[PDB]
Paper text:
The basic building blocks are derived from multiple pairs of native and modified Fab scaffolds and protein G (PG) variants engineered by phage display to introduce high pair‐wise specificity. The full complex contained the common components [name] and anti‐[name] FabH combined with either GF or GD to form a tri‐component complex. PG interacts with the Fab scaffold through an antiparallel β‐strand interaction with the Hc and a set of helical cap interactions with the Lc.
The GF variant is “universal” in binding to all Fab formats. The most promising universal PG candidate, GF, exhibits high affinity towards all tested Fab scaffolds—FabH (K D 1.9 nM), FabL (K D 21 nM), FabmH (K D 3.2 nM), FabmL (K D 37 nM), and FabLRT (K D 0.9 nM). The main area of difference was the PG's helical cap interaction with Fab Lc, since the helical cap was broadly randomized in the PG phage display libraries. The Fab E12H‐GF interface is formed through two contacts that bury ~530 Å2 through its interaction with Hc and ~198 Å2 with Lc. Based on the buried surface area, most of the GF interaction surface emanates from the contact with the Fab's Hc, which includes an H‐bond formed between Y38 from GF and P124 of the Fab. A further set of interactions is formed between Y38, G41, and F40 from GF with S125, F127, and V212 from the Fab Hc. Notably, these Hc residues have conserved sequences among all the Fab frameworks, explaining the universality of the GF interactions (Slezak et al. 2020).
Residue numbers in the entry:
A (entry chain B): 2 to 219
B (entry chain A): 2 to 154
C (entry chain D): 4 to 212
D (entry chain C): 10 to 49, 51 to 63
The structure:
């Protein structure tokens, strides 16, 4: 089976240099056309670079001109988007993909590339605690507030994966400070509020952080 | 998978509408077989209410050796009598295709531009397309390639 | 290039058509992709009208002039996603702005819950109060932050869940962030929600500010 | 940092010149945990905070 694997994602300073690597399996990249496509958070798809076969020969989105160099090393069955002069607009998930005529039939999973002056910082985990008034028919809502972390992503698990119903982890938001914060909530029976403990497991790999907060009434 | 392409070079580029296609085709063969290779060049058009595909020429290369073989496929030009007037002065596409005992295994698509050489004629067109003053430009530096796994055996 | 409509509500079995307008008329240059969240795009139609292998027959494409179109002859549950047209043009590849195809259902009311800053946070000098809007259709929702009946502008920051798989509903979380001094200054804080599935705006509040 | 409190339990890292510079940021990572901080290792390069109900 043909696969495509991106690599080299991470955090980078404005004006900094990064280099991604699209690693191929199931096919040799010399015969095929290979492209780089990126997706800003919650935005459409944007193409940046194409490498065509036989004769190298490239095409680049006007915005990434001169700053970006797509290329490929056939010996090592791999391509490379090289970004220099990187600006805050280039932060996105970078996809690499094989050409199918004028289409793109196979894709990587991507890597996130964050360019900013903020620094890598684990999250603060503050509670969202349930109340006794909030007995609807008998349903309550508690949550974790995952605040002031950089850069994405964070992952949030409720009760070590054993609490999968009524839960909504939210898209993270960028704040004026430049820090990420995310909230994760779960509705649960107001009955079991007293006898059943609820822990949210927060994992933020960029700073090697994994904490388990217990959310309890006052 | 048994045959792959190292290169295609379009010796006659740019050229007139009426001018033939000479395609220096560098290719490679791993594990030779007998049934022989059918190299087909296909004109593909898109116009107002139609999507026309017509074959342009077809060469058979025989016998097929192992290694890197470079052969030139001279192919017949298009026929303005069989093409709408718009595709004369607009972008078109050609599919160099190679097939093995009925089975197409690789298809290389190329953008192609066509227009008038004359300056004024380009600013204001003649009422009728004068194919003699049309000139074509193959974008052969950027192939668009499709590969199909055929049972070579 | 130019993709309409950006957004489409629909039901299973319906017949949907999305439309892309490109500068070029070359049918070879155009494909369509489907993308679900967290996943790489999947090719559906190549060179305007050709069904990419694997794709179901309910998908179909065609060109008429500069305009290209994808239709799904009868939606399916797995078909609810975002769709993108691609023009692989002469100089450069373009993608259309995209089209998100959400489910239609009956109008659901949000359970509105309010949450206080918690004292772990107020140790370090900043207080965040969030209002939650649980399971509401449609997304059309506006929360209004009120402290001591003084409408609040410039402080709130909301994010929205994607349509749920079971309820086909949405959740919204609006967080209100204030310096601990200004939290301690005022006493009662409330969240007012004017979903259209709410006759009157429902307000949720707390005290001991 | 090995964090263990009534409510919070987990770990983070940071690399630095001396353990006191590391222990300084770790402290600033007291989202209200630090209040009940036992604040206890050089060989193993671990620094632990403890609370109790």
């Amino acid at each position: 089976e043909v696969q495509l694997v991106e690599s080299g994602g991470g955090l980078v300073q404005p004006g900094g240099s990064l280099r991604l690597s699209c690693a191929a399996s199931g096919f040799n990249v010399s015969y095929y056309s290979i492209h780089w496509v990126r997706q800003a958070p919650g935005k459409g798809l944007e193409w940046v670079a194409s490498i065509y076969p036989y004769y190298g020969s490239t095409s680049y989105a006007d915005s990434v001109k001169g700053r970006f160099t797509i290329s490929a090393d056939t010996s090592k069955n791999t391509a490379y988007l090289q970004m220099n002069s990187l600006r805050a607009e280039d932060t996105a998930v970078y996809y690499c993909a094989r050409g199918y005529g004028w289409a793109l039939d196979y894709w990587g999973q991507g890597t996130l590339v964050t360019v900013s002056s903020a620094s890598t910082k684990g999250p603060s985990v503050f509670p969202l605690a349930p109340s006794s008034k909030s007995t609807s028919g008998g349903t309550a809502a508690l949550g974790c507030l995952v605040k002031d972390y950089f850069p994405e992503p964070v992952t949030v698990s409720w009760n070590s994966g054993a609490l999968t119903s009524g839960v909504h982890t939210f898209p993270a938001v960028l704040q004026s400070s430049g820090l990420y914060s995310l909230s994760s909530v779960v509705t649960v029976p107001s009955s079991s509020l007293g006898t059943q403990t609820y822990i949210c497991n927060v994992n933020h790999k960029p700073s090697n952080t994994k904490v388990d907060k217990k959310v309890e009434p006052k | 998978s048994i045959v792959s392409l190292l290169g295609i070079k379009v010796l006659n580029n740019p050229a007139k509408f009426t001018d033939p296609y000479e395609f220096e085709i560098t290719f490679e063969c791993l594990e030779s077989l007998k049934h022989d290779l059918e190299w087909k060049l296909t004109y593909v058009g898109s116009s107002r209410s139609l999507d026309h595909d017509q074959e342009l020429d077809s060469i058979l290369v025989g016998p097929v050796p192992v290694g890197v073989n470079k052969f030139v496929f001279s192919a017949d030009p298009p026929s303005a009598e069989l093409i709408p007037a718009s595709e004369l002065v607009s972008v078109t596409v050609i599919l160099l295709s190679c097939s093995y005992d009925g089975r197409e295994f690789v298809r290389v698509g190329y953008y192609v531009n066509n227009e008038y050489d004359e300056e004024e004629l380009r600013e204001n067109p003649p009422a009728k397309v004068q194919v003699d003053h049309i000139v074509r430009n193959i974008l052969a530096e950027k192939p668009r390639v499709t590969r199909f796994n055929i049972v070579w055996d | 290039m130019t993709q309409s409509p950006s957004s489409l509500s629909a039901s299973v079995g319906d017949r949907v058509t999305i439309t892309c307008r490109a500068s070029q008329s070359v049918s070879s240059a155009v494909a369509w992709y489907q993308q679900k969240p967290g996943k790489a795009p999947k090719l559906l139609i190549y060179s305007a009208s050709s069904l990419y292998s694997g794709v179901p027959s309910r998908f179909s494409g065609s060109r008429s002039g500069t305009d290209f179109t994808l239709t799904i002859s009868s939606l399916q549950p797995e078909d609810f996603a975002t769709y993108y047209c691609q023009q692989d043009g002469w100089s450069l590849i373009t993608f259309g702005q995209g089209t998100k195809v959400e489910i239609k259902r009956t109008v659901a009311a949000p359970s509105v819950f309010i949450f206080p800053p918690s004292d772990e946070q107020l140790k370090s000098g900043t207080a965040s109060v969030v209002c939650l809007l649980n399971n509401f259709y449609p997304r059309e929702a506006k929360v209004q932050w009120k402290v001591d009946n003084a409408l609040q502008s410039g402080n709130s920051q909301e994010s929205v869940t994607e349509q749920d798989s079971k309820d086909s509903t949405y959740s919204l979380s609006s967080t209100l962030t204030l310096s601990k001094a200004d939290y301690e200054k005022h006493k009662v804080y409330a969240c007012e929600v004017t979903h259209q599935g709410l006759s009157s705006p429902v307000t949720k509040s707390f005290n001991r500010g | 940092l090995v964090i263990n409190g009534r409510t919070l339990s987990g770990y983070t890292t940071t690399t630095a010149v001396d353990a006191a510079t590391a222990e300084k940021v770790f402290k600033q990572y007291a989202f209200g945990n630090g209040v009940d901080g036992e604040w206890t290792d050089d060989a193993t390069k671990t620094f632990t905070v403890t609370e109790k109900p």
